[PDB]
Each structure stands twice: as structure tokens, then as C-alpha cells.
Amino acid sequence: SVFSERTEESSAVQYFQFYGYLSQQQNMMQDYVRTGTYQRAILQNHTDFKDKIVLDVGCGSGILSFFAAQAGARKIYAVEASTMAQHAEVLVKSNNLTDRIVVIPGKVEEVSLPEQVDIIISEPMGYMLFNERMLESYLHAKKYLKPSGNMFPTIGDVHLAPFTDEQLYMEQFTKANFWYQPSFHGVDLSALRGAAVDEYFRQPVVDTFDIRILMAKSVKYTVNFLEAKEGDLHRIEIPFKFHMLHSGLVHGLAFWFDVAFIGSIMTVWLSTAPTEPLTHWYQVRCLFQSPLFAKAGDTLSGTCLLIANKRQSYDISIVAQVDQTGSKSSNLLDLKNPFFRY
Amino acid sequence: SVFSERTEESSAVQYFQFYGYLSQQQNMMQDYVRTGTYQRAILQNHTDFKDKIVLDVGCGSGILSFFAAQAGARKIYAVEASTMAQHAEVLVKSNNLTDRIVVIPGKVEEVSLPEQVDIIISEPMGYMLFNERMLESYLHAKKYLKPSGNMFPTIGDVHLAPFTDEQLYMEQFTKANFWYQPSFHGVDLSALRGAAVDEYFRQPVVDTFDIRILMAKSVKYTVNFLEAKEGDLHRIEIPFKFHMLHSGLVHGLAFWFDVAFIGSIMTVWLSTAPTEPLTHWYQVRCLFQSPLFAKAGDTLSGTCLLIANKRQSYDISIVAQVDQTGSKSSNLLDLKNPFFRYT
Amino acid sequence: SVFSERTEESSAVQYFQFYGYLSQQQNMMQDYVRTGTYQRAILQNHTDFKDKIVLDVGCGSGILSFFAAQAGARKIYAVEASTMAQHAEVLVKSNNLTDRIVVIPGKVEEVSLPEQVDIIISEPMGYMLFNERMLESYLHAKKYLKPSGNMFPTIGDVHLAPFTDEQLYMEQFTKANFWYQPSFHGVDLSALRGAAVDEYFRQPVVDTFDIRILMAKSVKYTVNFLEAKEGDLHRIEIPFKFHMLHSGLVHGLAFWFDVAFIGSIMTVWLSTAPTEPLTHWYQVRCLFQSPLFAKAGDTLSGTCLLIANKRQSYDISIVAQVDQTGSKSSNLLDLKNPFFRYT
Amino acid sequence: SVFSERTEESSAVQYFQFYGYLSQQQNMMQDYVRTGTYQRAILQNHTDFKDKIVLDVGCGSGILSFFAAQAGARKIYAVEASTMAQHAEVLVKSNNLTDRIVVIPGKVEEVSLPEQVDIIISEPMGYMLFNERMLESYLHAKKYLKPSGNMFPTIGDVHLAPFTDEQLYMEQFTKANFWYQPSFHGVDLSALRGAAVDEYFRQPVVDTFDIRILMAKSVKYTVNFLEAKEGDLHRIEIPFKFHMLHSGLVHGLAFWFDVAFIGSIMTVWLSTAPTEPLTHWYQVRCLFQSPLFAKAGDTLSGTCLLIANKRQSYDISIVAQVDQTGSKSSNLLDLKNPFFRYT
Numbered sequence A: 001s002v003f004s005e006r007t008e009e010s011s012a013v014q015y016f017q018f019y020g021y022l023s024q025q026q027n028m029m030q031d032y033v034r035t036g037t038y039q040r041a042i043l044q045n046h047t048d049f050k051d052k053i054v055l056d057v058g059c060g061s062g063i064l065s066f067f068a069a070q071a072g073a074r075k076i077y078a079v080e081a082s083t084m085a086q087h088a089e090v091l092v093k094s095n096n097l098t099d100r101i102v103v104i105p106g107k108v109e110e111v112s113l114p115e116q117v118d119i120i121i122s123e124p125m126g127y128m129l130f131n132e133r134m135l136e137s138y139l140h141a142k143k144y145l146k147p148s149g150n151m152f153p154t155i156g157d158v159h160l161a162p163f164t165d166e167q168l169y170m171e172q173f174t175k176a177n178f179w180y181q182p183s184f185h186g187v188d189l190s191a192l193r194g195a196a197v198d199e200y201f202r203q204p205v206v207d208t209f210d211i212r213i214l215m216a217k218s219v220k221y222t223v224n225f226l227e228a229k230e231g232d233l234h235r236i237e238i239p240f241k242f243h244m245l246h247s248g249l250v251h252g253l254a255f256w257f258d259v260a261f262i263g264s265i266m267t268v269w270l271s272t273a274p275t276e277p278l279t280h281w282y283q284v285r286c287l288f289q290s291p292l293f294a295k296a297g298d299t300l301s302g303t304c305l306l307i308a309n310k311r312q313s314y315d316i317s318i319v320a321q322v323d324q325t326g327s328k329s330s331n332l333l334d335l336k337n338p339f340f341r342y
Numbered sequence B, C, D: 001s002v003f004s005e006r007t008e009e010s011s012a013v014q015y016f017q018f019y020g021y022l023s024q025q026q027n028m029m030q031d032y033v034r035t036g037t038y039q040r041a042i043l044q045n046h047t048d049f050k051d052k053i054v055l056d057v058g059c060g061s062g063i064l065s066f067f068a069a070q071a072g073a074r075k076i077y078a079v080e081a082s083t084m085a086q087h088a089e090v091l092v093k094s095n096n097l098t099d100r101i102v103v104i105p106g107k108v109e110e111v112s113l114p115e116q117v118d119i120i121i122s123e124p125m126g127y128m129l130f131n132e133r134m135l136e137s138y139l140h141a142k143k144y145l146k147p148s149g150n151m152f153p154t155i156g157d158v159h160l161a162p163f164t165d166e167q168l169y170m171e172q173f174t175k176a177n178f179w180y181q182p183s184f185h186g187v188d189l190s191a192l193r194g195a196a197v198d199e200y201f202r203q204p205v206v207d208t209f210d211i212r213i214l215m216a217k218s219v220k221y222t223v224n225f226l227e228a229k230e231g232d233l234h235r236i237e238i239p240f241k242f243h244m245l246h247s248g249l250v251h252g253l254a255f256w257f258d259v260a261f262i263g264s265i266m267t268v269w270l271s272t273a274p275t276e277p278l279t280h281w282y283q284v285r286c287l288f289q290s291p292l293f294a295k296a297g298d299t300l301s302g303t304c305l306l307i308a309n310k311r312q313s314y315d316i317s318i319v320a321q322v323d324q325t326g327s328k329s330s331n332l333l334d335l336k337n338p339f340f341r342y343t
């Protein structure tokens, strides 16, 4: 299947074992913003579901299937690759919905569905949206979608903005300074300081923050899931040009994302922006190894490049430059292994 | 190899990737208890190391090799399976020790050493001592040990004790009761309440605790690494009989361990007992599904059975009964995925 | 002369230029602790001055000579090498003391005095006591001292103790990190990162601090000016052994000093200890380039080595080691060019 | 050499020791105004640099040379007299520019250069522009300049303006009045009050100020470095006639400067005016001994005379007169030792 072609067995096993735990399902579900927003999107666009065939990709506990059933769907095919699939059917039976919700265990890239569907629903967003590479399974599932079909979510917006946070930068450097020691119990570790600094700064920082640290209006990169193809997500190049509102040191880039459910009756947005209520996604920040000084009015231009790897994630290379001075900074990040600071 | 037959590749890859991070080496190294005690054990027993051949199993950063070098070792073969090895060779060079420390990348079950060694050193202990199943690699390495060779650590003590902690026990039901509601956004989740409970009780709890929660003197099970074989660690049966010091409800068993370095000059102990300073191992507690009432003076008898799995960990089966009342309780735990509760 | 042989002309010119300013005399004089403490020492030991011949080395404005005159000295020879000598004579005249205070312009190593003296007074202390190397001029002056004569101050005590201050350390590391930039306006500065760190950490930090940052009771090094010779101050080796009271990171050593005026009537102390009221000397701290971790009970041993240079100051070499672990740290500091952190 | 004949060795030693510190290079480089403006001037006039020979006088770290290299210079001779030169060559190698940048240690008046150059670049400006007397080294370098060559900066403007700051003027007497007391610890200091006053008024004040204290449009004296000779800078006579915008007491003159880079493509200005963002040069103020009252519309006429001394600085003589009143005031200052008042 296309899934095994793009994934190390080691990672996939780990991935689906993680999602096999009810405690994780609980964590996801107790996010009122996430769960409530999904329900609002489905129910207020109920006409897009009424008496229709639905495909739910990565149903987990099955919550989204139930929303679709509440909206009046004729039949929901709920596909789930973890052992959660067995718990889902238990809920379907105890909620008397066996005539309407059909759980199909397996990967959407590997299962056979009885028929094409009118709409696909899913929650494929990870940290920075793209983490876990579930967006490609979501787009793969489009093979079962009718020409006149819809997708929930319909589009995705990545938001980038430069930030200043001296406290965060010093925190990571305080940790790396361990490896600068000339005599730790009589051992010289200093030969590895270079390696240590790189590794710590290779960590995306997951947490929330006050928006006053943002130094410029954010830049947006939009993905339309209805027209996009699987191949489009192997290499994502996000160019940016910021016009600085404040003078100071830029310590990195901040990331968050919006998704929109564009239904017939109305459009519902789900945002993880720092101006919005917190979600289990929080926000993501990537530190530069060396800060860049920029005056207000200067322009900070560069590229954020995401290249998919076989561990179900992306390698992030960020290059940034102050156009007036030529001061340039780089960083390479491993999105798979973040630093949770909350 | 002997390693690949007892480990799923999936688990092994994730395992060695974890140990390839300098941040992880740093966490271990900043444990003064662990690192300080090892140095003390080696340096205070310099006679066991001076002009000897040494094998360091899972050297990681190589810290233990350097200690052996400080103690006067003739040659140290440092074996490391993760990408930490490439970093180890760097430190050996920058510390001018290439003539004495030889880094050998690979798994100890798969590499070939040029010669037999006088002593083997290592830090193979995981949670509850046995977690990660590295102890089997440590014992495997004995194929390279000369007769009359020594091992650092030399012996291991697992300790079991019954405890009472009403809040820990009740916490598990507060969490699972999330699933006991008839309309979560219009959905009846109650059907999964049972499974949720089961899931939470299969998790060993990692954290520390006040020694006053202990209901009896601990029972210890000893592994002597000098006589032990790999096969001895696939099935570990720890029978126990506790004589209760306090009356109350027993909610589970607490585990910790000691290791001893037995050298010519002296014996050095490394303990993770709750009476001792805290380590990155902390302590481990396993809850019973149902608490047992025990009088002071009553006897709590039963068995703790550890069965190794191919995910580099153990399945724990605990059954206990109060002999005077016949009240019986059991539990099954998966040590591979504990609940880190410390705060 | 002995002064020109131990001093660069470039440094000497700037040095005596500095003390030629009335604004600097004012700063010294407005140190109530210093000036008041000196007056207490001289007047309360007035019997050591009554009808005696006095030599005041580096009188500056002449303030100590006036103290001596108040105490009843028959005659005071006041030696001053800067142009301040011209101002001193103005005060001597406007205060009608020409019969008792005689200003001698020149360096104490070069002037000729009519007679031997009973007591020498002076303020030869700089930062960390030894900076400015005036103590050698003070000791040189003993050639004019009678066999049974006295010296004010009589003895000096240097105190050193380890401290912890994460914020001070990161401040200096933050400053040096400028040179780690890979593209400053398109230029790679990283090649100088090493040189930058060295330069910044070579600076002793002058400021005050909370005594709670000290990690152990201080060690004392005493200089007795009555028996000491100049040659003793060219190389000062201060060994130390601290018994750690608290566990934590040691970021450096803190220095302060006491001097004592031991007269016939009583002993008066002048202290720049952080437990005492502040002076224009403040305290001095020397950072290690890399901190050392020590538990409470461990011992921190090492050496502070002071070597006098031709710029009228000292080069400081500090080596420290945690005896139990072997963790070692060093640093070289240039006392002549401090970092003033004071508010 | 031409440099040694106009400088006492004592000052020269101290001068080049100062610029040998990376900490000061950093201080200069972190001035965005200075460094940014220089880069703008060089890169936006790239046609003045592409494939030409450049001479960089007092390159320090070499930053300006790297800019010239970015603009496309074929070869840059970078001259540096301090020990910074060794650091410069290190950067040249690590930035892989050894084929184009040649670092020449030594004074520009003493070194040997192989060839004539197309353009000279440098940042020779001190406080009040002329301080440090490096502008004379900049002009000396024209012996290596081809006719029709260019100079970056090309011209320099010093700006003069009258100001009012009653608190600054009164501050000097508050400080000097320390000496006006009949019993400081029993000593009458009053005889030195006059000397103290004189000393404070000879110090030009370095800091910044609000432009609302300025009493008239500034008067400017221009130095065009392309036709100017070294000899033009030994005696600078700046006559001035201010037309007062405000009525009030004038306490002195404020100084700042502009330099312009006149290239083929465009002209770039670097200004230290108080209306502009602050720089590490700040502004300079020189007090009159007695304030002068001037009505708005009145004319304040006089002369500012700068006379070079052997301490690499200037003696400033200011004479001013209110033409309508005949009210006259003067002052003589030593720019070598300013008073840093900032914050």
C-alpha cells in the first residue's frame, strides 16, 4: 500500500499503539474547543449530511461518526487502524446505531469500501498542522469521494510570525552549556558542545505565549484539501516576507494554524492562534541558533521548507534574512520530537 | 543474533533512537547519585582495575570507560549500539585516551571482541531493575569474561512492600469516570468505563512517596550476576509473605532496587529506596484492583510473577491474599508503558 | 629607583594622572566608612602619635596627615607623587599646620627624609586589596621606620569564598555569544567565539551581593605588613579548602578584605565584607568559565595564584577542584581591568 | 615616523591597548546606525568598489573590509595598528577571503603598501569628530591614493549650537562646594573650592540631551577630506555667529557631527545630531564659565579654537560675546578627559 511505501514499520507500530489508549482518546475529547467546534461545524451544516454516505478517516473513539449520525447521515463508514476500532463498535452498539455507523478496521490506504461517499470527515491535524503526516491519508481517501463531494475540514491555513523571547532562548542555552565543561568528573565534554547546541535547537518548542512577543503581521500559507494531491505534501515550501513593526532581536518563528469547514449553510473556523482560546495543539516556536537584529521598518525575508521523512513527520529547514543588512540565520528542526514547555 | 530473537525490530529501533540523544545522556549524567556512586565504586576499588582489561557494556557517552581509565585500566572495550557511539569516539580522542579506550559500535550480542576481559562494567538497570531487559545483554557479555572475572554491578536487589495510598487508588477511578456519562455531546460513553478502568490499572505508577505509607518490612529478591544466566530473567517468580506492621487497606505493592559493587577493597551500594536520596529511577507502585484489609499482625501472602515480552519489557502478575480472612486480590500490569506521576 | 624597575612608564603616567584630580580625592573622601574608620583608628590610638615623627605614604589630599596632627604628632612627613601634593600644601597652610605637616613631593622610593620615623600611616589598599600594587610602596617605606616602629594598617586579611549566581554567569555568556553569530551583516564571526569568552571571563566583577549566595564559610589569607618584605608581594599563592554548606553550582570565588589598625589603646578593623556596610571598594568576584557542581559535605580545594605585573596590578590564576569527583575548573583574570556592575 | 613625532608614547600605548579588546569592537559593531549606514554607503555605491583596489584605514575587526568585499572589490589592504589585527586575519580566513583581503599590521604612517589604491575607507571620527586625532591618519593615507580617487567618508561637518541647561551648570558647583566646608572631619577644605570649580569646567560633558535646550540654529564647519591636508587639522578655527531663536541664559556650546559618503550612485549621511537616533558618539557640551543673557533675535558671536596636543586630543578655547550687550564669556577645555554624564 501507499502507506507502507512512505513509512518505517517502527514508526507506524509506535504511532498506532499510541492511539490505541483510551486515555489519549479522553485527552483529545476533553478539548472543548476542538470537540465543540467539530460538532458546531457538522450540525449547523447538517444538510450536507442529511441522508448521505459519509467516510470518517481515523474515527478513533468514533465521536465524529456520532456527530454525522446526529446530523442525519444515511450511513457512516468509520475507518480506524488502531485497536480503538474495537472500542468504537462497542459504543456504536450501546448507542443503537449499528444500522447507520459501520466500523471498518484498517488503514484507509488498505481497506476496501462498499461505495463512493458524499463527504469525508476527519481530524488530520497535528502539531504545526502537518505533523504525523495524516493529511496524506486524508487526501488518499479522496479516491472514495464523488466528483460532487465535500471535505470536512475543507482548507488549512498555516500562520507564521517572528517573535522575541530572551527567556526561552537562554533556557535552551543554559541546557547546552552542560557540554562546554572542561572537567566533568575529570572528563572533557567540550568537544561535543557543537553537537549539543544543534540538538537542543533542533527541538520545536510546544507551548503558548503572550502575543506581544510577536514583531510583525503574520504570513499565511493555505492548503485546499479538495483540490490538493498526496504528492503535494512530500515537500512544502513556505516563503515569507515580514514587515517589522518593532525593533529588537528576532529569536525565531511562531507557528499556528486555522482550518475551515466550508459547508452549504455556513463556514466554521477552528483556530489555534494565540489570540484564540487554547487547544491541545497549543502553538509551536522554532528558535534560531543565533538571533537576528532588525529595526522597525526593516524586512525579514526567507523560506520555511518541510520535507517528509519515513518516520511519519517532516524535517524543517528555516532560512531567514534581514534584507537591509544581509544578516542571515538558519536552523534545521525535527518536528517529530518537540519540547513541551507548558 | 541472540538479541534480535528476543526483540521486535520496531521496539529496538525506537529504543536506540531514544538513547542516541545527548539530552538523554545529560539527564543520566546529571544524576549525582548514579554518576557519583559509579565513580566511587570504581576509584575506591582501583585494585580491581589497575592494569586490567575492561569491557563497558552500553557505555553511551563513555563516562564509565573514563572512570575505569582513571582507575588505571590497561584497556577498555566500550560497546554501544546507538548513534551515541560516534560521539563517544570523539570524547575519547579529545581526552587523549585512544590508546586505552576502544569504542566498538554495535550490539553486545553481535560484536566480536579481540580478547577476553578481566571485568565487565555497565548500568543495565531500568525501572523496577528489570525494565528495558538490558540485564540480559549484561549477562550475555559474560561470554567474554575470564573465569574469576568480576562484574560491576555484582548483585541486584529488588524490594517489594505493601503500601496504602487511598488518593492514588481513587485517582484512577476519577479519571476513568470520564467515560461514565450518558450524553457527552449527545453520545453515551458509559459502555467503555470498564475498559478505561482496566487500562489505568495496568499502568505501573512512577513517582516517589513517603515511607509512612508502607505497611510492612520489604521482601527482597536477589540476582547474582556472577552466577546468573540469561534464561533466568525470562520468568521471575517472587513469592512474598508480609507481616503487617500497621492495620489498614493495602492498595498495592511498591518496588525499588539496590545494586552492589563488590570489589577487593570495599563494597559500594547504590540504592533507589524511598529512604535514600531520589534518583531518575524513582520508585514504582502497582495497584491491586481491589484493596485488601489487613490487621496488624495478619499475614499477606502471594506471588509476583514477571514474564519478559518482546517489547523489551515485562508483564507483571501480582496475586495476594490475607491468610486470616481469605480476602484475595490480583492485578496484571504492563511495565513497558508506566504512568509518570511525579511532580 | 625601585619603582621604575617594577613599573611601565605608560601605566605610571596614567596612574598618577588619575590621582591628580580633586574629583577623585572627593570620591575617596566621601566614603564615610573609609574616612571615619581611619579617623577612629588614629584618634583612639592617639598615644601612638603624640609627640612622634610620622610618615604618611601617598597622603593625596593630606587627610590622614591632618588626623595625625589632631592626634598630636610632633611632625608628619607627607609623601605624594602626583600633582595633588601642590593642593595638599594649600590645605596645610589654610589650616595653620606648617609647623607639623611637611609635604614631600615625589615617590616614596625616591625621596630623602631628614630622619627615621616612629609610625607609618597609609591607605595602600586597592580592589581585592592588592590592585595598584601600592602595598609594595608601603613596605618599601619601612626603610625609614625605626626598629620598634608601627604601621597603620598593621595587617591585612583577604577572604575568599565560593558563590552561586546563575544570572551573573549567563550575563557574561550572553555578552560573549555575540561572537557566535554565523552571519553578522553577512560576516561569520564564530571563529572568534573562543577569544570572546576568554576576554569577558578575564574580567573580575566589582559590585555587591547578598551573603546568601555564598556556598561555604570563607578562607582567610593574612599579610602582616610589619614583617613582610616587597619580594613577598611579587607572587602570592593562596591555597584554599572549602567545606560546602549547600549543594549547588559554584560559579566562582568572591573576594573581600579586612585591614586592622593595631594601636596601643585598641584595635580598629576596616572591612569590605558583604555582611558590613558598603565601601568604594565593594566586593570582587571571579567567575569560572564553567561552573562546578558540589554536594553539601564535599570539599572544594585549589589555589589562587597572584603574580604582579608591570602595569601596577596582578594576573590572577584560580584553579579549583571538587576532591570527591575530580571536577576541575580554571580561570585567568586581569585585575587591572574590572567589570563595574554596580547600580 | 609621522605618527610618533606628534604623539607622546604614553598616550599611544594606552590608545592601542583600548582598541585591542573584542569587547569594544563589539560595542562599536552593535551600533546599528554606524554599521548599517556604512554598509548602505558601500553597497549602494557598489560601482565605486567592483574590481577596484581598496585601502581600509584602522579596519579593527575588519568589518568595513568585508563590506568592500561584498561590493565587489578586487583587493583590500586592511591596516590595523592594535592587536585586533591578529583577530582580523582569523576572520579573513574563516570567511574565505584570503584571496582579496590582506591584513597589514602596523600604523598607516609606518607600514609599506605595494600600490596606489582607488578608494580609501575608514571610520576615523571621535567625540566632537576630531578626538583621537585619527582624521590626520586618514588624510595621511592619501599618499597611497591615486588622483581622482575617492574617500569614504568624503566630507565631515562639525555642528555648533548654544544651549541652556541650568541644572548642568549648577551641578558643577554642587560638586565643588563639597570643598567649601570649615570642618570635614576637623579639616578646613575651603581653600581648594576654587581649584575644584576650575577642574570641573575644563571637562567637556559627554551625554545626550533634549533638543529644546538649543538656543539657535547650529553653525557648521566643513572638512572636505579629498582636498584637505593633515596640516589643516592641527589648528581648527571655527568662528560663529548665532542668531538666537529664544531669549534666555546661554550656558555653553553643544557639539555634534555629520559625515557624508559621496559615491557615484548616491550620497549617504551619518549624523550624530540630537534629533537623530543615539550613537556611541553621543553629543558633547562645553560650559562657559559665566552664562550670557541673549534676547531672541540678538547675535551671539565668537570663536571656537581647537589646538592639537601630544595626547592625541585637542585643547578647546571658546570665546563668545553678545554683540548687543557687550556681555562676554570664555572657557578653555581638555577634550582628552571628558565627563561621561549619560544616565
Ligand SMILES: NC[C@H]1O[C@@H](n2cnc3c(N)ncnc32)[C@H](O)[C@@H]1O
Pocket (backbone or CB within 6 Å): A003, A016, A019, A057, A058, A059, A060, A079, A080, A081, A082, A084, A106, A107, A108, A109, A123, A124, A134, A137
Ligand atoms: N487522529 C488520529 C486518529 O486517526 C487514525 N489514523 C491515523 N492514520 C490512519 C490511517 N492511515 N488509516 C486509518 N486511520 C488512521 C489514528 O489511528 C488515530 O486514531
Ligand SMILES: NC[C@H]1O[C@@H](n2cnc3c(N)ncnc32)[C@H](O)[C@@H]1O
Pocket (backbone or CB within 6 Å): B003, B016, B019, B057, B058, B059, B060, B079, B080, B081, B082, B084, B106, B107, B108, B109, B123, B134, B137
Ligand atoms: N545506559 C543505556 C545505554 O546502554 C545501551 N545499550 C542497551 N542495550 C545494548 C546492547 N544490547 N548493546 C550495546 N549497547 C546497549 C543503550 O544504547 C544506551 O546507550
Ligand SMILES: NC[C@H]1O[C@@H](n2cnc3c(N)ncnc32)[C@H](O)[C@@H]1O
Pocket (backbone or CB within 6 Å): C003, C016, C019, C057, C058, C059, C060, C079, C080, C081, C082, C084, C106, C107, C108, C109, C123, C124, C134, C137
Ligand atoms: N593611595 C593612593 C595615593 O597615594 C599616591 N601614591 C601611589 N603610589 C605612590 C608612590 N609610589 N609614592 C608616593 N605616592 C604614591 C597616589 O598618587 C594617590 O594619591
Ligand SMILES: NC[C@H]1O[C@@H](n2cnc3c(N)ncnc32)[C@H](O)[C@@H]1O
Pocket (backbone or CB within 6 Å): D003, D016, D019, D057, D058, D059, D060, D061, D079, D080, D081, D082, D084, D106, D107, D108, D109, D123, D124, D134, D137
Ligand atoms: N576605528 C578605530 C580603529 O582605528 C585604528 N587606528 C587608529 N589609528 C591608527 C593608525 N595610525 N594606524 C592604523 N590603525 C589605526 C584603531 O586601532 C582602531 O582599531
